[PDB]
Ligand binder design. Sequence first.
Ligand SMILES: Nc1ncnc2c1ncn2[C@@H]1O[C@H](COP(=O)(O)OP(=O)(O)O)[C@@H](O)[C@H]1O
Ligand SMILES: Nc1ncnc2c1ncn2[C@@H]1O[C@H](COP(=O)(O)OP(=O)(O)O)[C@@H](O)[C@H]1O
Ligand SMILES: [Mg+2]
Ligand SMILES: [Mg+2]
Lengths: 273, 273
Amino acid sequence: AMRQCAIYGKGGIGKSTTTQNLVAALAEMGKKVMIVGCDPKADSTRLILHSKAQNTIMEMAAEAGTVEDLELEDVLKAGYGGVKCVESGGPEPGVGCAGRGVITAINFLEEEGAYEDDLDFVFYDVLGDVVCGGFAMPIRENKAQEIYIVCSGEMMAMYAANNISKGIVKYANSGSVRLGGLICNSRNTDREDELIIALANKLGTQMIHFVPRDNVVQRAEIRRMTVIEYDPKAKQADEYRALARKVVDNKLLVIPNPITMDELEELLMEFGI
Amino acid sequence: AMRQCAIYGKGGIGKSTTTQNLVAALAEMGKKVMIVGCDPKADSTRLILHSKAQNTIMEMAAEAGTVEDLELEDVLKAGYGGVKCVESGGPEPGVGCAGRGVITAINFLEEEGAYEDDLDFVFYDVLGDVVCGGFAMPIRENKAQEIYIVCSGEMMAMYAANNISKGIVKYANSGSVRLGGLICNSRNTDREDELIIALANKLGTQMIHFVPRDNVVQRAEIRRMTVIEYDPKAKQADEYRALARKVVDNKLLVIPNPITMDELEELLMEFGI
Ligand SMILES: Nc1ncnc2c1ncn2[C@@H]1O[C@H](COP(=O)(O)OP(=O)(O)O)[C@@H](O)[C@H]1O
Ligand SMILES: Nc1ncnc2c1ncn2[C@@H]1O[C@H](COP(=O)(O)OP(=O)(O)O)[C@@H](O)[C@H]1O
Ligand SMILES: [Mg+2]
Ligand SMILES: [Mg+2]
């Protein structure tokens, strides 16, 4: 068995930082993990690889001729803790559908045998500002059974969480894609943890962890590292370890109950953000 | 003549707040303006209309049968200062292309004669996290000749500005879509104005205005108003008046020069954000 997990959320909310640090912590406990980048920014694996970024399947297929001319051992790269890394890529802005590379990448990985039984986890890092095209494909086509949404007390981030939840509900009659939890990536606002707990309860899920804002993240990422690798003694390293433990132990996977915009506005008014 | 202007930027950066306050200031000086909402969130006109939001062309066409059964006088609504307001809408998350409603809306407005000569400005408020589908259509199809990008010292917001600029460059051989400027919507970070000026210079444009972070925005929006209407004496009202003056007077419209991610990272390192 392997658990297929996807991390969704609005742009800039902390998906790639949270995913790579979460995964580094899983590797540190002895789990075998693959990260599949599903965001056109294509820097979802750089902290594991100590790299600028990673060349994408779309780019490599174009240089090789076709995606059939690519070998898995050429596209998958291993970094910290043996974590395996791949980037989908996508077309340039203004050209075609921004999520088209996700479909190509996941189909390539499936056909070429990347989902080997020894993997414990696969994490997809998915753009979540629109839920369509290849960005909806992990939900539509039952690739990510456990969705975790990174958000914050920011209204836009909560709106995005509600939008992603609506996409999960839309495909509830097939496959087994479920909402696993909300991850609060803090903006140092008071009662922010309470706010995201409240949102999770309304959706029918849970806040699996509250990730503090910590400058050690920037110091690690300037050096192309996770905090787990950069400073294993850091308080923030223990925060990601706690998040990883709770993901491993999580048993609550639900069809969420999306809320109205009135309910969202009431949440923010209540917690005075 | 009328100036067709589009406001792009990442989600939650301040597009709708900036656009509606900018437009309220234009109406206050005696300009006739239409706002076309091109973001699925569909709350781009609520501060002009004093409303929860606005029912969308996609929604109204479905209730009426076809878009041909809609009349312009039924969909366009006038609010503060006589500003005319319309929302595109879009499909629910996980269903079809999130930008499909933008194409339907702009074509409806053109055919039904919404672009009356007496208009001075049209502002499109466009989702900018992906540049594809209907969200690229104002650029691809030459609807918004002047693009203004709202951003901040946030790396994701600067990345989005660079992505939108690449889309402008892609369609430079046809039509006349141009980059008009960057609008810095502050996060109260030091040297943030300097950073966005530097980014604009590298792209070949300008920072047209630095909008401060001001709590009066939240107090106005709780009451479904622009700051211009809510507190015309506010310092922040004068900030939006200054932005509107500089948009009116702006003559620099360029084919931008997008930068590498190395150049972007160098910018942030330099200005110590
Ligand atoms: N808990 C945190 N503390 C400090 N900085 C953070 C934290 N989480 C994310 N960041 C920073 O926020 C920025 C955006 O994070 P990222 O993971 O790239 O967002 P996304 O992948 O959702 O677009 C990055 O510069 C990252 O270093
Ligand atoms: N200059 C500002 N000062 C204070 N709050 C702001 C400012 N600009 C935007 N906001 C707030 O930021 C949030 C997002 O702004 P919005 O215009 O809705 O973003 P977008 O339309 O780009 O998604 C809103 O709650 C808005 O009130
Ligand atoms: Mg990312
Ligand atoms: Mg908006």
